[PDB]
Design a protein around this ligand. Sequence first.
Ligand SMILES: O=C1c2ccccc2N[C@@H](c2ccccc2F)N1c1ccccc1
Ligand SMILES: O=C1c2ccccc2N[C@H](c2ccccc2F)N1c1ccccc1
Length: 149
Amino acid sequence: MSAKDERAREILRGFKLNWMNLRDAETGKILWQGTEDLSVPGVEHEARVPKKILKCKAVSRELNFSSTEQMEKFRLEQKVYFKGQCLEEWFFEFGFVIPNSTNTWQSLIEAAPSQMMPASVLTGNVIIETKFFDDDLLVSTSRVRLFYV
Ligand SMILES: O=C1c2ccccc2N[C@@H](c2ccccc2F)N1c1ccccc1
Ligand SMILES: O=C1c2ccccc2N[C@H](c2ccccc2F)N1c1ccccc1
């Protein structure tokens, strides 16, 4: 165990995703919302999402989170996996996090013209992997399996 491993565990222990939603970045329409902490590691989460999301050039995300611990550079790396192959990756940076704060993070997520296979082929075969970092310290990795409905 290193000092860094111990730190990453303290950060994870103090972290919660309280709620989240997704919107077409054209309409601002809600496409999905939830309060399950999809960031919790070690379980495969499941989400059902409307199939039309696949027709959106971009989506806007609101992610509401609490952190007991101070973070210098809170960031995420997110990958779409189809039957085990990475189709697309995104990097997003929140930056400094105040200890014991609760924060809403808005992000614009742009698909590359990926999300090209039909929803019927995709559904149950897509995993979004999310890695949570503070700078280069890996805090956690979680996974959501997607169903398009
Ligand atoms: O941002 C998230 C997200 C945030 C915290 C924890 C897990 C996440 N996984 C996906 C995501 C968001 C909403 C619904 C399902 C889903 F898999 N996700 C997402 C949404 C769009 C593009 C890339 C990742
Ligand atoms: O299915 C989605 C999607 C659905 C809900 C939440 C996150 C998702 N990640 C991407 C995606 C789809 C549309 C717009 C942006 C985007 F990152 N995405 C996707 C999936 C497979 C191939 C390409 C993009």
